[PDB]
Each structure stands twice: as C-alpha cells, then as structure tokens.
Design a protein around this nucleic acid. Sequence first.
RNA 1: GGUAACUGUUACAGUUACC
RNA 2: GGUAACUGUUACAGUUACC
Lengths: 71, 70
Amino acid sequence: SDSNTITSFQVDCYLWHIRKLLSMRDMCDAPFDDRLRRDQKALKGRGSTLGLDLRVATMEGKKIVEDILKS
Amino acid sequence: DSNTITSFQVDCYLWHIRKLLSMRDMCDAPFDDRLRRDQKALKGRGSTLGLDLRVATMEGKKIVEDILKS
RNA sequence: GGUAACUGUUACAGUUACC
RNA sequence: GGUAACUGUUACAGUUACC
C-alpha cells in the first residue's frame, strides 16, 4: 500500500472527528455542518477503497496529529 | 454571528494542522489539492468577516483544545 | 463513468454569514 | 439582488490510490 495515502486518510478521519465534536456542541454554522456531511460520506468511501476500519483509522490519525503537534 | 466566527477559527487551526502534515511530506496529492483549495477559501472567508488569519488560528487552537478536553 | 476520493474552470437550485 | 464560503446537481479538463 501507499504510505502517504494511508496517513492522509487517518489524519482526515481524526480531523473529521474534531469537527463533529464542534457540531455536537452546537458551536458551528450551517455550512460547516454541510461540509461535515460531505466529508462523512467521502471517508466511508475511502475507507471501503482502502479496506480500513474508520474507528481504527481515527485513532491512528490522533496519534499522528499528536506526534506532529508535539514537534 | 458567534457560530460563524467559531467555525472560521476552527477551520483556520485545522488547516494549520493539515499544512504541517504536508510540510513533513506525509500526505498524498489530493490532500495537498484540498489544502490549496481551503487556503483560498479561508482567505475569502477571513476577508468577508474582517478577521486576521493568524489571530483566528490561535483562537481556533484554544477552541479545539477546549472541546477535546471534555 | 474501471472503483474510490479529490482539484481547476462553468452553470443551475439551495444553505449560511454580511449589505 | 449583491459579496464570500459552502452543499447538491451538471459540463469540460485533470490529479492521486488501487498488483
């Protein structure tokens, strides 16, 4: 598999999770929710294409983001 | 509108995180394509709202850290 | 339209913010 | 109606992953 393809998917999953948290707290505007919906479907399609569980990918993306932010 | 401003500040900080991934050469070409699209989009939204991008990015960082704290 | 995701340019319908 | 961003749809041209 292509490493940067996987990494990009895992990071994208984690940042979708962060955006969803904002929406769940009623702190985002309507276009932000529209993009959340578009990206939600896109990540499901990418996960199916790569054969990856979305929850596992999210946790991996969390660790990647945390590792970069710490440096 | 507070939710409009909050969404912009968060989007600014999340763009910053994505750009750091790109600068480490850890991302794929479509990820970079979206980074360029969103750079243009945020410039337009920042102009429309009258908000400084550096300051909004710092405020987005605080918001993101606060909602994650829970 | 190979599957999936996306980008640039264009149009329409619409959403949100602002006037 | 306008400015900006976006969502859906569409036209043209592309990018990446997939032995």
